[PDB]
């Protein structure tokens, strides 16, 4: 639980769970999981976290 | 594939699960070796089971190829170490990391599907004489995994 | 809940749940569904190398306070 | 006391901390494990990064570095 371990966990939390490189930027509708970037999303028909069908993808901005 | 594979390796080093271990073979990040420890209070207890992992170049969009090298007695794993398991095929998810795949396989050991088996003879024994199944799986653990 | 346990989610994030020693596995999955949005039918919980079955309790598996359960996706051998 | 710390995880999830040197052999580590945990060396299997570790090699030989985690697997007793 060091300051670096906490900063890393906050950065990993914001990061795409597929490529693990770019920040998340797309929310799946209707399951609501925010887990991929815009480069990984076009390849996906089901949510990688809950296997829900993806009916739409909204570009999200954490202001 | 490489960058994600390196991240998984680093993420493992920080905190691997108790049940498994994995890393590259030699200088090749696409070919790993892994261990699954047999679950306590199972016929596999005390066993250390080795596996090969081959990441394809389009990992993680396609699943890794995973097979046992240690022989193991199970309805869904054959004598060649092939694992018939839906998450290694049509039910793959790109968010599954190698650690979760190994834990998933470990959880298959005491949760076989004898109704759609890879090794029919083993599945019939599992369904009709569980003490015989357990005895044989214990014997193979002793012979191959210790 | 009267004690705490930990769940390592699919992405490796560790969450804390408040549970009872006699909580059923399905109740644990319902708590995960509320915190992480995963349908219970897609949750596979693993402790000590073994999957936890609905209808059983934490005490059935000797899951104690501050145990860590590992969450993976529903799977089926074949 | 030690040049670097490594961690040893048991099947129950308990992690122990060891003070080691990169030149320490796997045999040395098993002796330190017996000191901390009371497990005799001949009952210990050590695993790192998917490999079972051989007694005569060093931590450095296996790419074990500071804060690396090894697995302690007991032989069926
Ligand atoms: Zn991505
Ligand atoms: Zn989802």
Numbering used by the authors:
A (entry chain A): 556 to 618
B (entry chain C): 2 to 147
C (entry chain D): -1 to 76
D (entry chain B): -2 to 74
Per the authors:
Cellular inhibitor of apoptosis protein-1 (cIAP1) is a RING-type E3 and belongs to the inhibitor of apoptosis (IAP) family of proteins. The RING-mediated ubiquitin ligase activity of cIAP1 is essential for its function in both cell death and survival pathways. Dimerization of its C-terminal RING domain is important for E2∼Ub recruitment and ligase activity. cIAP1 has been shown to function with the UbcH5 family of E2s to catalyze substrate ubiquitination.
To better understand how dimeric cIAP1 RING domain (cIAP1R) activates E2∼Ub for Ub transfer and how UbB could influence this process, we present a crystal structure of cIAP1R bound to UbcH5B–Ub and UbB. The structure was refined to a resolution of 1.7 Å. Because cIAP1 exists as a biological homodimer via the RING domain, we used crystallographic symmetry to generate the structure of dimeric cIAP1R-UbcH5B–Ub-UbB complex. The structure shows that cIAP1R dimerizes via the RING domain, the C-terminal tail, and a helix that precedes the RING domain similar to other IAP family RING E3s, such as cIAP2, XIAP, and BIRC7 (17, 23, 41). cIAP1R's RING domain binds both UbcH5B and UbD and stabilizes the UbcH5B–Ub complex in a closed conformation. Crucially, cIAP1R's Arg606 forms hydrogen bonds with the carbonyl oxygen of Arg72 and the side chain of Gln40 from UbD and the carbonyl oxygen of Gln92 from UbcH5B. The UbD-UbcH5B interaction involves UbD's Ile44 patch contacting the Ser108 region in UbcH5B's α2-helix. UbB binds UbcH5B via the Ile44 hydrophobic patch of UbB and UbcH5B's β1–3 surface surrounding Ser22. Here, UbB's Lys6 and His68 form hydrogen bonds with carbonyl oxygens of UbcH5B's Pro17 and Pro18, respectively, and Leu8 packs against UbcH5B's Gln20, thereby placing Gln20 within hydrogen-bonding distance of the backbone amide of UbD's Gly47.
